[PDB]
Amino acid sequence: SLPAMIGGVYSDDNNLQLEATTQFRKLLSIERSPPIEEVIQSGVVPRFVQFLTREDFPQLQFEAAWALTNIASGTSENTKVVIDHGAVPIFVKLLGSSSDDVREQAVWALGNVAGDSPKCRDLVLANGALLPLLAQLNEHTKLSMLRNATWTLSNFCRGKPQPSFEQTRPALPALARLIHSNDEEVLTDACWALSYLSDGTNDKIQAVIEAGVCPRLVELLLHPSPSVLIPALRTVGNIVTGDDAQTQCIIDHQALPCLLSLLTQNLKKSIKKEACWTISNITAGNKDQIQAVINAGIIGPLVNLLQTAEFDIKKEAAWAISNATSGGSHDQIKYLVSEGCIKPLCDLLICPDIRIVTVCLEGLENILKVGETDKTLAAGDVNVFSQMIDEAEGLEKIENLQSHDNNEIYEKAVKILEAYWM
């Protein structure tokens, strides 16, 4: 069987070559546990790569590409064999083939190679795969190729360390168009790609925004499929980690009402968590952006999550409320208190995550400052917010933080107690 197949691929008879290659492909295409190792050891990889260059024989190119694709679907060591035999530049050249089946297969093969690791991704990019890949995406491209190409594109953008932004940037205009697909697989992969490109310094974010994607990304927050929502949400989140003007591009398209709906629908915890995280980077902004959060009606639901949600969600909500107390106006802070934020901030003063304890203490100190200002302006007897913290059992928790191993926490607690309770 295998000896006959090897003989077929190593013959110079067109039909034996095709027959034997096709047999190898079927072998590598079985339901599970394809014998990739055994095919590699048989020594046929170099011949398959030679077959890639037979432009007189598209069917053979296709079968060989399919087989090479499935070998590169295996382990890194499997993939290395394909690389060592020079397949990458040849696949890149096949992106220009007149055969649609061959082109699509080449796109898939390069996706598998780039998916192996950041080094393999970078090798594919360095062999000039990106432009040819984009080159044959147009108004007439069929769905199968659109899906394959979008998936491969996301592989070209994926991974840490991240690919050079100059090498992935040409992808942005195509991705900006692809997120307008209604196909869920295209949307999924295009959004993941944008999630990778938007994760980093603010210049990257700026390039993403300039590609025009904000309006559509926001629409996608309302997509019924979590497979689309998740990466769309991640990309929106990434964008609002940028500066105030960058963050404003998201707010301007009614993102905040969409985000609120993610908090109040019955959605996965991971989704609510990232919605909160996105919101916290908005409340990390200016007073107008904090006001936009308030106006959308987010605070009530957010406070409720801070009080009652799973811990991963509470952590993000804590940052969101605390950021707002830090950047917000006197009057804005008073509104957060009226929505009931004091008690759940106090409850978290005993949580095991010291970063969260610190965030909540900071929030409470900002609230206390507002309460003290209110007292002073009227020449009143009491800081009303200090009494509310006492009633919420926050004061005793802050007292006990004087015993904390962490200096930051310790110094802050003492400072807070000395300023507001003597």
């Binding site: 994760d199 940028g242 990390a284």
Partner: peptide
């Protein structure tokens, strides 16, 4: 306050 990732 801005947190990447």
């Amino acid at each position: 306050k801005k947190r990447k990732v």
